[PDB]
Amino acid sequence: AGVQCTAHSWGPGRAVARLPRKHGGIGAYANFARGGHMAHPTTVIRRWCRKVNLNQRRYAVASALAASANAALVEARGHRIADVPSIPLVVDTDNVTKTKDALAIIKAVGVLRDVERCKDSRHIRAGRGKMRNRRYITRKGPLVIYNTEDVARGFRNLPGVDLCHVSSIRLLELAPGSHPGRLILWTKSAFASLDDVYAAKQNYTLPRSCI
């Protein structure tokens, strides 16, 4: 881009500035010329990824989970927890396959306003981003973690809900916006296999608790 045309400087003595010019006299090949190249063109060899040690990744997951179990950081993160029995919220659901029954459980436990918060917040974003396949924004609600129980087909449709199998937990889902305290609806089996998961992590011990 900018370098397919043919241009050379005219030199001094013709009462014009010394940039390269196309046959005819039009400016070219400068970042300050219309139709010139970039001063420093962008290139795909930019280092796009970054490295993190394995302990540090695990420690981030565990600190995000620790944050998830506080009735103060969950309320200060943004969710609606006024009518919930407990913040470590373990509910036996068995198999939910109909959105109507999944909504029924969420109501019967008390997470109905978080999902209504998510549902009534869908809008069109403020900028250029709506020409680039990011037209709508919705807020985020509860995260359901499951182990042995078919639930995704009953929970997925609901606005502001995400699904996570307990053996592979995602830090970007635990701390959306890089803010730690997410509201988590736990299946009984997932909440009971958590310690087994940390035992399956090999030559790993959890960091020391402090004051």
Partner 1 sequence: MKLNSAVTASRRKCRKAYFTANAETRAKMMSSRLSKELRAEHKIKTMPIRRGDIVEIFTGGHKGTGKVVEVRRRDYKICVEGINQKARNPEAKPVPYPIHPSNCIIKELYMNGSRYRAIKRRQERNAERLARI
Partner RNA sequence: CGGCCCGAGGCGGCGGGGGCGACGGGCGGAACUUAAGCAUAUCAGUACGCCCCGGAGGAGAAACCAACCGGGAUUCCCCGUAGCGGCGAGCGACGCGGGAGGAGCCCGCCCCGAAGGCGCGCUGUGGGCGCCGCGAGGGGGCCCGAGGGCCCCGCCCGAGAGGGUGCAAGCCCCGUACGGCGGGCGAGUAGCGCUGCUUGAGCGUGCAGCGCGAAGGGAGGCGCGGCCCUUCCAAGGCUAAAUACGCCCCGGGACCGAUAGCGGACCAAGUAGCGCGAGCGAACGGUGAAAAGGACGCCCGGCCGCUCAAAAGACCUGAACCCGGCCGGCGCCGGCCCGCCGGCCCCGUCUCGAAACACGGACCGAGGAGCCACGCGCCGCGGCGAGCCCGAGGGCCCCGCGGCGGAGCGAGCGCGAGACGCCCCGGGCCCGCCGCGCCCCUGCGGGCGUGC
Partner RNA sequence: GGCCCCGGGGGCGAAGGCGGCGCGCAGGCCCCGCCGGACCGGCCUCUGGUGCAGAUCUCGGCAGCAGUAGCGCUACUCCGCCCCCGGAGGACUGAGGGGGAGACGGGUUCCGCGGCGCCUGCAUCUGGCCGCGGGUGACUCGGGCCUAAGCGGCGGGUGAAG
Partner RNA sequence: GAACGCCCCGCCGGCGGAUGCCUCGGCCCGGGCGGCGACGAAGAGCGCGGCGGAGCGCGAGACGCGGUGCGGACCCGCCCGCCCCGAGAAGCACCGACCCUCGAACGCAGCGCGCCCGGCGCCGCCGCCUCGGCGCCC
Q: How far is the CB of 201 from partner 1 (least distance, A)?
A: 31
Choosing from 38, 131, 210, 211, the residue that interacts with partner 1 (CB under 8 A) is 131
> Does the protein bind Mg ion through residue 31 (CB under 5 A)?
no
- Cβ count near 44 (within 10 Å): 5
Q: How far is the CB of 90 from RNA (least distance, A)?
A: 21
For RNA, the closer of residues 6 and 148 by Cβ is: 6
Q: Looking at residue 111, what DSSP letter applies? A: -
Tell me: is residue 19 an annotated ligand-binding position.
Answer: yes
- Cβ count near 49 (within 10 Å): 4
* Phi/psi of residue 75, nearest 5 degrees: -70, -30
Binding segment for partner 1 (CB under 8 A), chosen from 48-56, 104-112, 130-138, 201-209, is 130-138
> Does the protein bind K ion through residue 53 (CB under 5 A)?
yes
Q: How far is the CB of 209 from RNA (least distance, A)?
A: 12
Determine contact, residues 102/155, Cβ cutoff 8 Å.
yes
Binding segment for partner 1 (CB under 8 A), chosen from 7-15, 40-48, 131-139, 164-172, is 131-139
Rounded Cα gap, residues 145 and 158, in angstroms? 15
> Does the protein bind Mg ion through residue 9 (CB under 5 A)?
yes
Q: Which residue bears the tokens 């397919």?
A: 4
Q: Which two tokens stand for residue 171?
A: 């830090």
9 binds, among Mg ion, RNA, K ion, none (CB under 5 to 8 A by kind): Mg ion
97 binds, among Mg ion, RNA, partner 1, none (CB under 5 to 8 A by kind): RNA
Rounded Cα gap, residues 198 and 206, in angstroms? 8
> Does the protein bind partner 1 through residue 135 (CB under 8 A)?
yes
For partner 1, the closer of residues 134 and 201 by Cβ is: 134
For K ion, the closer of residues 53 and 178 by Cβ is: 53
Per-residue exposure over 3-35, b if at least 16 CB sit within 10 Å of its own CB, e if not: eeeebeeeeeeeeeeebbbeeeeebbbbeebee
CA 80, 86, 90, 94 dihedral sign is: negative
Rounded Cα gap, residues 157 and 145, in angstroms? 16
Build a one-symbol-per-residue string for 151-170: x at contacts with partner 1 by CB under 8 A, - elsewhere. Answer: -----x--------------
Binding positions: 19
Point out which residues bind partner 1 (CB under 8 A): 131, 133, 135, 156
